[PDB]
Amino acid sequence: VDFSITQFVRNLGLEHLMDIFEREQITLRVLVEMGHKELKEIGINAYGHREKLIKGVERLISGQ
């Protein structure tokens, strides 16, 4: 069970997407490599939500 993705997604205010991440067995390490194509594939349908996740990963990486 990956708790690090739950924390990352809650911080973005995207906890409504956790049902998708859990069903798709997405860990934080896997999410980090997902772009618009991959996120649209798993059902993250709104461009603004995908951008929030993608920019959220860039900032998590650049911040560290």
Author numbering: 874 to 937
What's written in the study?
Since polymerization was likely to hinder crystallization, we used the polymerization-impaired DH902/924RET2 mutant. Reasoning that the mutant domain would still retain most polymerization interface residues, polymer contacts would be recoverable at the high protein concentration during crystallization, as illustrated for other polymerizing SAM domains (Kim et al., 2001, Kim et al., 2002). We obtained well-diffracting crystals (1.53 Å) and solved the structure by molecular replacement (Supplemental Experimental Procedures). The TNKS2 SAM domain, a 5-α-helix bundle similar to other SAM domains, formed a left-handed helix with a pitch of 46 Å, whose axis coincided with the crystallographic P65 screw axis. The SAM domains interacted in the well-established end-helix (EH)-mid-loop (ML) binding mode. On the EH surface, basic electrostatic potential predominated while the ML surface was predominantly acidic, in line with the salt sensitivity of the polymer. The closest approach between the two surfaces occurred around the N terminus of helix α5, where EH surface residues A919T2, Y920T2, G921T2, and H922T2 engaged in a network of hydrogen bonds and van der Waals contacts. Y920T2 was the most buried side chain at the interface (125 Å2), interacting with various hydrophobic ML side chains (V903T2, I899T2, I915T2, and M907T2), which collectively formed a shallow pocket, as well as E911T2 and E897T2. In its non-mutated form, D902T2 likely forms a salt bridge with R932T2, which may promote another salt bridge between K928T2 and E906T2. Surprisingly, despite its importance for TNKS2 SAM domain polymerization, R896T2 was not involved in any contact.
